[PDB]
Amino acid sequence: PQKQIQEMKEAFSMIDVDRDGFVSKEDIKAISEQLGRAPDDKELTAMLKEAPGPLNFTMFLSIFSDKLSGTDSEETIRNAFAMFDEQETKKLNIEYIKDLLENMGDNFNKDEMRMTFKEAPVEGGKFDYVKFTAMIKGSGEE
């Protein structure tokens, strides 16, 4: 979490159009419109209450540290997969991990199943959980 902060501010400048110090409820509808699919009214409104008080940056880095609490190391994650790859292939036969989720531990529910594999780096029946974890949260690019 350090260098990320430096990149955070960058994410703070773009949002803060008028540089009104903060992210006015309007500063959001800003870049988003000038950039994407502007969220619904309430979507915006109830998007601020997520933070205790008027968001400067500290409150910006705040609401962002919560949704990143239980982040098991990329290693523990990639090492959690290979725990099934009893052959050191850094890979899993798709139909495997597939059934290994939808029917194991907690019934990966249908929906959550799809939304995942949608981008699944699968190829040739294989499944590089390595590159997938590297993508699930981590190295790669921004």
């Binding site: 029917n103 194991m104 531990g105 907690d106 019934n107």
Partner: protein, 153 residues
Amino acid sequence: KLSQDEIDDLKDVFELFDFWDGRDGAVDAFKLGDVCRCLGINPRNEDVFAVGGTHKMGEKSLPFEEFLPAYEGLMDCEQGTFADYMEAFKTFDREGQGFISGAELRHVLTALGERLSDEDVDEIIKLTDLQEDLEGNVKYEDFVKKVMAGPYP
């Protein structure tokens, strides 16, 4: 009966099987016998059925207040002493030295009694490491010892 600490060996293992077939608070009947083994036991096939149990995963899900009373049974049933096994195997040893030919082992383990699985036997060997001499025979006595012992000596 059983001891709280003993059941702690059942509680810990149960929530571990119900987990693999989905945490719903119920374990697959067929998977039941394979569970009871996780407690220093070796109940017979027929027996494991005498207390519920199934084959294809999808017959009955057992909960707990019912899973336990089942262990209560497959606990007053017969275990094979070093003797029994020895006396049995002997009923296949003609020479005397106490050696059993190769094929035969993989044969008796399948043919007679209750064949279990080509793989299995091939695993029980590849595992507890039993090597055939340079003729074609293994001293069963020395084998049956390894099985009785357990994978973790």
